[PDB]
Amino acid sequence: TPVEEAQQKTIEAITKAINYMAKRRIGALLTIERDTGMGDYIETGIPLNAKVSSELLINIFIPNTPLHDGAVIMKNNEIAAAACYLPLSESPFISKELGTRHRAAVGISEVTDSLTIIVSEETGGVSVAKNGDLHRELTEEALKEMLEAE
Amino acid sequence: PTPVEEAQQKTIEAITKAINYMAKRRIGALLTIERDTGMGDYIETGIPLNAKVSSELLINIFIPNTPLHDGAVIMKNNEIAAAACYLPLSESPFISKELGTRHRAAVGISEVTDSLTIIVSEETGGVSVAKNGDLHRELTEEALKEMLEAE
Ligand SMILES: COC(=O)[C@@H](N)Cc1ccc(F)cc1
Ligand SMILES: [Mg+2]
């Protein structure tokens, strides 16, 4: 169906962008809103309400640029805003070598049903936060499975 | 001012802030503002954005060596319609010989539409505008803003 094709296109755009940033160790934080509304966090960023493309996602997270500091929040198959605040988790059970991107992802996943993707600037490793847990060192296939399950 | 007029002022502020940033840093840019002649055929050659304007997004688009920086951004009213768009190259002899493809594209679209195109030179940081087949170079910030306000 059209809705199915659209979801698959968005998944492909996300994984292409994450693959580019993982290879270049570009830090990134991308939260996908689900049933829990995230408007209060969306309002903290720069409004975009933009079509998703791998190109735009990459251009957003380029280091040393206006939009790269904070989270992209996606809602209704669009990029709602960039450079958004997410709350930092205080969980003592996050790997101690991880910093604030990952604690922000876990933080929002504590208080919403959202799925957040993190690319590490240290390693290029890719992780996902959901339900208060961080799933680390994902392959491309693992991230796709998580996006399709979501 | 009405909401339409306030929105236009916000859009002009975003554009001028972005252009000023990119001029200082010698970041090449090519930004076409659609007016009454529709540019859909050119918009369709780019990557669709249909995004709300901000100075931040405009700057991020044109950062060198990124997916969206090559080609034109085309704006429709208060939205960035698409980036990395094709524009036709002018053959006009009144384009300074040292100028490259961004200025020739801007004059090109200005020959077949009523649009206003802003160009930042990656060589000098100079700001120019193309409109109605003419290129006006080395604009001050004040001149650019007045041109946009008049547009
Ligand atoms: C060298 O390649 C890698 O680091 C990947 N295994 C990481 C990676 C994970 C998800 C994705 F959508 C793209 C890339
Ligand atoms: Mg002069």
CATH number of the domain bearing residue B99: 3.40.1700.10
User: What value, to the nearest 5°, has the Cα angle with vertex B113 and ends B116 and B75?
Assistant: 45
- Helix, strand and coil content of chain B, in percent to the nearest 5, comes to 35, 25, 40
Tell me the C-alpha to C-alpha distance, in Å, between residue A61 and each of A64, A128, B92.
Answer: 9, 17, 38
- Confirm if B122 and B140 have CB atoms less than 8 A apart: no
Count of domains observed in chain B: 1
* Nearest-Cα residue of chain A relative to residue B55: A66
Alpha carbon of B85: minimum distance to chain A alpha carbons (Å): 13
Residues in B closer than 8 angstroms to A17, CB to CB, are none
User: What value, to the nearest 5°, has the Cα angle with vertex B139 and ends B133 and B141?
Assistant: 130
Q: Of the candidates A112, A120, A107, A136, which has an alpha carbon nearest to the alpha carbon of residue A61?
A: A120
Resolution as reported, in Å? 1.2
Q: Of the candidates B101, B79, B74, which has an alpha carbon nearest to the alpha carbon of residue B90?
A: B101
> What values do phi and psi take at B89, rounded to 5?
-90, 125
Contact at CB, A59 and B55, closer than 8 angstroms: no
Residues in A closer than 8 angstroms to B49, CB to CB, are 50-51, 53, 56
> What values do phi and psi take at A124, rounded to 5?
70, 5
Contact at CB, A55 and B48, closer than 8 angstroms: no
> What values do phi and psi take at A30, rounded to 5?
-135, 115
Q: Of the candidates B96, B91, B71, which has an alpha carbon nearest to the alpha carbon of residue B82?
A: B71
How many Cβ atoms sit within 10 Å of the Cβ of residue B146?
Answer: 12
User: Relative to the alpha carbon of A138, which ligand is closest?
Assistant: 1
Atom in ligand 1 nearest the alpha carbon of residue A138: 9
Q: Of the candidates A104, A131, A130, which has an alpha carbon nearest to the alpha carbon of residue A142?
A: A130
According to the entry, how was the structure determined?
X-ray
CA A118 – ligand 1 centroid, Å: 11
Q: Does B91 touch chain A (CB under 8 A)?
A: no
Domain that includes residue B45, residue range: 3-150
Give the Cα separation of A73 and A139 in Å (integer): 22
CA B136 – ligand 2 centroid, Å: 7
Query: Residue B17 corresponds to which amino acid?
Result: K
Q: Does A142 touch chain B (CB under 8 A)?
A: no
Give the Cα separation of A105 and B148 in Å (integer): 41
Burial A113-146 (b: 16+ CB within 10 A, else e): ebbbbbbbbeebbbbbbbeeebebebeeeebbee
Specify the length of chain B in residues: 151
